[PDB]
Amino acid sequence: QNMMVKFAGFLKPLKKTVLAIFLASLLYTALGIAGSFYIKFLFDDLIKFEKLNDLHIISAGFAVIFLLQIFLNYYRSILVTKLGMSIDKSIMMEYYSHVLKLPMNFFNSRKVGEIISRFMDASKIRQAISGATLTIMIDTIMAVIGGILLYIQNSSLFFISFIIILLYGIIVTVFNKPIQNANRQIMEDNAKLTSALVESVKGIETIKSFGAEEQTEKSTRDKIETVMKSSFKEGMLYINLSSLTGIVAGLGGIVILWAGAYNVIKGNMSGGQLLAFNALLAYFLTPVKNLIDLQPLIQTAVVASNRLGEILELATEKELREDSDDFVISLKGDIEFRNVDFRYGLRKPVLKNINLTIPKGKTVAIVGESGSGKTTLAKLLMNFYSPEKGDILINGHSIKNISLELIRKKIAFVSQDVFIFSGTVKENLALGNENVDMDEIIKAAKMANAHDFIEKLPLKYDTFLNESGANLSEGQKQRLAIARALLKKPDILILDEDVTVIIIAHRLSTIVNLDKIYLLKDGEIVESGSHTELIALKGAYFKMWKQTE
Amino acid sequence: QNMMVKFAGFLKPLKKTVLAIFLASLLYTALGIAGSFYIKFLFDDLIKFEKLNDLHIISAGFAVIFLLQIFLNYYRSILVTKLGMSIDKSIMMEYYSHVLKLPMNFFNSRKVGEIISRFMDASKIRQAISGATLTIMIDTIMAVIGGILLYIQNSSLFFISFIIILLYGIIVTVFNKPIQNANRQIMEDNAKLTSALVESVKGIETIKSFGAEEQTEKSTRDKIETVMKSSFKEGMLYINLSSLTGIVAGLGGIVILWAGAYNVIKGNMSGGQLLAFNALLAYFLTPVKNLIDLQPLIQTAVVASNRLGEILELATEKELREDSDDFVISLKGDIEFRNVDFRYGLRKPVLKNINLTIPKGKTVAIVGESGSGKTTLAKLLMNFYSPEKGDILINGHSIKNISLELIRKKIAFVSQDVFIFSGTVKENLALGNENVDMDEIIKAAKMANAHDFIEKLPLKYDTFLNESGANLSEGQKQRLAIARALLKKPDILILDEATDVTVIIIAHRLSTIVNLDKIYLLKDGEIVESGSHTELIALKGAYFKMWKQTE
Ligand SMILES: Nc1ncnc2c1ncn2[C@@H]1O[C@H](COP(=O)(O)OP(=O)(O)OP(=O)(O)O)[C@@H](O)[C@H]1O
Ligand SMILES: Nc1ncnc2c1ncn2[C@@H]1O[C@H](COP(=O)(O)OP(=O)(O)OP(=O)(O)O)[C@@H](O)[C@H]1O
Question: Which of A34, A368, B334, B400 is most buried as measured by Cβ atoms within 10 A of its Cβ?
Answer without folding.
Answer: A368
